[PDB]
């Protein structure tokens, strides 16, 4: 009942943003095929692999 001052689309935007990171990470992992691609993952695994 308000003019864009308290609209509930913001929570949907936030949820889409949260799932965007998962989507990008999944696509990148499909592309590379490696479980760890950078330091954002478990750094210990990267060090052990190296």
């Amino acid at each position: 009942q308000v003019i864009n001052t308290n609209s509930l689309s913001l929570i949907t935007q936030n949820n889409i943003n949260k799932n965007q990171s998962a989507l990008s990470s999944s696509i990148e992992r499909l592309s590379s095929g490696l479980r760890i691609n950078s330091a954002k993952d478990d750094a210990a695994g990267q060090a052990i692999a190296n």
Binding site: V2, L8, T12, N19, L23, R29, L30, A49
Partner: protein, 49 residues
């Protein structure tokens, strides 16, 4: 080599499922966003102008 490959080399079986996961959630949330943005004009309709 076999031991090292267990830490790297992400299992594609779970990754394709997670890909479909993320895609479907993203587009469903997009449609829900559109539906939510389709809500405000009820007050304009009640304005009768």
């Amino acid at each position: 080599s076999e031991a090292q490959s267990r830490i790297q080399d992400a299992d594609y079986a779970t990754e394709v499922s997670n890909m479909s996961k993320a895609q479907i959630i993203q587009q469903a949330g997009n449609s829900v966003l559109a539906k939510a943005n389709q809500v405000p004009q009820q007050v304009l309709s009640l304005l009768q102008g």
